[PDB]
Design a protein around this ligand. Sequence first.
Ligand SMILES: Nc1cc(F)ccc1C(=O)O
Ligand SMILES: Nc1cc(F)ccc1C(=O)O
Lengths: 345, 346
Amino acid sequence: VPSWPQILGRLTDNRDLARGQAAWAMDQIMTGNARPAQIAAFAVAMTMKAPTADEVGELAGVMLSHAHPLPADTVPDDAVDVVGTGGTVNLSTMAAIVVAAAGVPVVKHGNRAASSLSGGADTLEALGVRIDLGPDLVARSLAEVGIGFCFAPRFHPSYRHAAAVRREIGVPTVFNLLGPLTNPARPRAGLIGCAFADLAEVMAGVFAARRSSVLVVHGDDGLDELTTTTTSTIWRVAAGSVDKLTFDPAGFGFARAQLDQLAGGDAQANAAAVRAVLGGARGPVRDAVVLNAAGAIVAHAGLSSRAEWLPAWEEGLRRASAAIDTGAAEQLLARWVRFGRQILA
Amino acid sequence: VPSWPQILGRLTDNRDLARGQAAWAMDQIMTGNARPAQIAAFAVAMTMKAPTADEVGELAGVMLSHAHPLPADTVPDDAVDVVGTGGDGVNTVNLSTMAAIVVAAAGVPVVKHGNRAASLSGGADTLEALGVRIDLGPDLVARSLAEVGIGFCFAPRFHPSYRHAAAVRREIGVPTVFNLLGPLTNPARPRAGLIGCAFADLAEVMAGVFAARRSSVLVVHGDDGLDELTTTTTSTIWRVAAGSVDKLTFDPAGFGFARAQLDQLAGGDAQANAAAVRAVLGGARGPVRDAVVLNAAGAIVAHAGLSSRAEWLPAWEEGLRRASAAIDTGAAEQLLARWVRFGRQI
Ligand SMILES: Nc1cc(F)ccc1C(=O)O
Ligand SMILES: Nc1cc(F)ccc1C(=O)O
C-alpha cells in the first residue's frame, strides 16, 4: 500500500520506484490531497534520484488523465509540437509559425513566462494572438488556421497545487519535463528542446514508449533549441527506439553565431523580432528559426516513413526557408490573429 | 546574497553549500520565514547530497541559538547524554532509556533530550510510561539534575521555534538530515555522551560536529546497523576528544559478552519498553541487560574522557563494572523510583 514515507524513503535511498508509485504520488498531487511539503519532497527527491522513463510516463499519464481533451476527431493525425523546456528571443514560437506555414499542423502548449512550465504565451500575446481559448476554439484554430495554442492553466486546472509549489521552491525539477509530455492535443510528432542535457535521454525514452516521431534536442552550448553557435546532440525517436546523434549546422552551410545575437528582452522586443524574421530579415535569428522548423518537419516526416537523415534535413530546411520567403509564414501569423479577433462576434 | 533557489539548486546539483548558507536556511526555518515546501525541499536535498560536518554544525548551531537554555550554573560540568538517532524502521529507545538510568545510578549526571513520537518510536513515551514527568521547564530540569542526578529536556518545550520544521517532518515522514539534530541540540549542552547512529556515513559526520565542540563523546554504530553498541557483532566507534576523532572497530566479545541475535534487542512501543525497563533494572539477565550494560559503560567511558586519566581499556573495564554494579546493587532501580518521586512531589 503506497505512502509518502515509503515512496520518499525509496527515492532518498537512491532506488527506482516500484511500478505504480509515481502514479499514486501524481494522483495525490492532482486531487489536492498532497500537502505542499509532500509535493516539494517528492519533486526534489525524484530529481536527485534521476527519474526513469517509466516513472516520467506515470507522472505524465496521470496528469493527462486530469486534463481537458480537445474534442474527438479534431486534431489531425499528423500534428506536431515545437517547444523548449526550462533553461534569448523565442525561437520556438517563430519556428512553430514557420512549420505551420509549411503545411504541417502545429499544436503548442504553454504558460506565461517563468511559471510552470514551457510557455511562450507572452510573446504570442504581444503579437495579438488570443492565447486563452477552450478546447473547441483550439480545435477550430487548428482546422481553420493550421495552428493552435493550449493554455496550460486552462487545460490543466488540477495542476495548480503543484504549480504553486514549483513557485515556492523555484529550483528546476522532474516536473520541468512534464509540459512536452502532457500537451492536451497529444500530437505524435515534435521537435522538443531540453536545457538539462541528462533529462533529454529520459524525455526521449518516454516518446519512444509512446511510439512518437520526435527529435529531442540539446544545444551543446546549453540551449533548449537547435543552435547555430555550435553543435547539438539529437535524440532521434521513431518506431519505438531512440538513437543519439551529433548535429552540426555547418554541414548545411550555416555560419557560426554568437549568443549575444539571439538575445531577447520583454514581450514587445521579441514580438519585433518575430515580425522581422517573418518579414524576411536575414541573420542568425532567422538561421536558428529555419533550423528548428526543419527539425520539426523532419520529425513530422518520420510519421509516414523513414527517409534518410540528410535528405530529410535538406527538404525540411528548404520548406522552412520557402515558408518564410513566399510570405506564407507572415500571412499565417496574420490569419491566426484574424481568427482570434473573430471570436468576439 | 542567499535565497531558496540558490541554495536548493546548489544541493540538487550535488554541491556542498558555501559556508553560512546552511545557517541562513536554518534561520529562515526557525524564524517562521520558510514555507513548508521550502523546508521540505531543503531537508530532502540536504539528505540526498550528503551533509558535511560543517553544514550540520551550522544547522545545529542555529537551532541552539533559538533554544531555551537551562539556568546559569545548573548543569554539572561533567553531565552526559545517552541517545540514538533512530533506525529504519526500528529503534533502541529501550536501550537508551535504560542505559541513561544505569549511568545516572553509577554517579554520572545525565541530561537527556527528546520528544514523544506518538507508536513505536519513543522515547519521552517510555519515560512517561514509567511515571516520569517529562514536561518540565528549565528551572525544574535543573532541580531534577541536582536532587536526582538525571533530567529530561522535552524538545517541544525547549525548542518552541522548531515547530515549523517538526510539522514538515511529520507531513513527509521520511528520515532526513534533521534526524541528526537531536543529539546535537540538547539544550543543556552536555559535553560528553554516548550517541548512537544507524548509518555509518552519517555517524562520521556527527563525530566531526562533536569534535568542533571539544566534547568527549563516543559516536557509535553497530556493524549490524543498530544505532547503539550492539552485542550481535562488532561496532564502529568514533571516539571524539580534544578536537579530534579516533575511529576504531569495537568487539564486546573481548569483554566476554556472548553474541546475541538481532531478534532480541527490542524495542517497541511505550509499554513494551516500560516492562523491559522494570525487568532489567530488577536484575533479569539476557541479551537486553548485556546491551544496556555495554552502552552505559560507553557513556561512562565518554564521561571519563572529560577528566581523562584513564586509558581506553582500563576505562572500559571500569565502566562495565560500574554499570553492572549499578543494576545489581539496585541503585538503578532506586534511582528510577527517586526520579518518579521527584516528579510527583512538584
Ligand atoms: N493550473 C496550472 C497548470 C499548469 F500547467 C501550470 C500552472 C498552473 C497554475 O495554477 O498556475
Ligand atoms: N517544537 C518542536 C520541537 C521539536 F524538537 C520537536 C517537535 C516540536 C513540535 O512543535 O512538535
